[PDB]
Write a protein that binds this ligand. Structure first.
Ligand SMILES: Nc1ncnc2[nH]cnc12
Length: 242
């Protein structure tokens, strides 16, 4: 009958990235702390807390901290949209983080790696089992989408200027996709000894077409990322993280 499951923290920067899972919430309760709105409930039996963070590093990191400190989630899933870097991937595809780095952190002047904050690893690491879970989570099939593991990077600039995309690409050649909150969530999670995984779907190919492509395909990327979350929640049912 009843599964014994962890409590999942689920975070998205904007309302569409979160609206779907917010809906399928059962026994919904919504609470407010420190300027954020947290939606506690269940998804197919599993206990979750869903928060829309706002855009950018600091906002995502603060929501994450409250998510962990106030609601004691066992792990954090960051979901949402991202700009594709990997040419193999096309709008709607999904990238599960295999690692996450900031692209807009630079303390190389002092010997740190590009993207790396002092007293932090160069790359934040998602839990293997959360990664493994979403890997199996690709029984995807709605009723076709590609889904991959790859490097995801994070900065506080929306990545549109051919020059910005080039510099990022040069520093982080293996990058599958880019967004504005992933590494910040991971940074907060590390600080709070909490497992994370970042799941993001391509709302655009990063570059000249990005602003209107993003607006066109945000709802698609929300649908696809939200689905892989639900599956991943299924794979984690009755399990605990190693
Ligand atoms: N091109 C882009 N840059 C940063 N974040 C994004 N999220 C979706 N598309 C993006």
């Amino acid at each position: 009958l009843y599964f014994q499951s962890m409590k999942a923290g689920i975070i998205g920067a904007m309302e569409p990235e979160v609206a779907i899972l917010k809906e399928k919430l059962t026994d919904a309760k919504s609470t407010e702390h420190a300027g954020y709105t947290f939606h506690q409930g269940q998804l197919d039996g599993s206990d979750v807390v869903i928060v829309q963070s706002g855009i950018g590093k600091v906002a995502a990191a603060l929501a994450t901290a409250i998510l962990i400190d106030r609601f004691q989630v066992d792990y954090v899933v960051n979901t949402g949209s991202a700009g594709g870097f990997d040419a193999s991937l096309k709008v709607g595809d999904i990238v599960v983080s295999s690692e996450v780095r900031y692209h807009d952190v630079d303390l190389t002047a002092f010997g740190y790696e590009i993207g790396q904050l002092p007293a932090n690893p160069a790359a934040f690491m998602p839990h293997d089992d959360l990664v493994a879970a979403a890997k199996k989570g690709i029984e995807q099939l709605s009723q076709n989408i590609k889904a991959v593991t790859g490097l995801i990077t994070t900065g506080d600039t929306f990545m549109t200027k051919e020059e910005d995309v080039a510099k990022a690409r040069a520093n982080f050649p293996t990058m599958a996709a880019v967004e504005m909150e992933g590494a910040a969530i991971a940074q907060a999670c590390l600080q709070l000894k909490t497992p994370f995984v970042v799941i993001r779907s391509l709302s655009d190919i990063a570059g000249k077409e990005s602003p209107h492509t993003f607006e066109e395909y945000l709802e698609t990327a929300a649908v696809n990322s939200s689905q892989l979350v639900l599956n991943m929640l299924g794979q984690l049912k009755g399990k605990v993280l190693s």
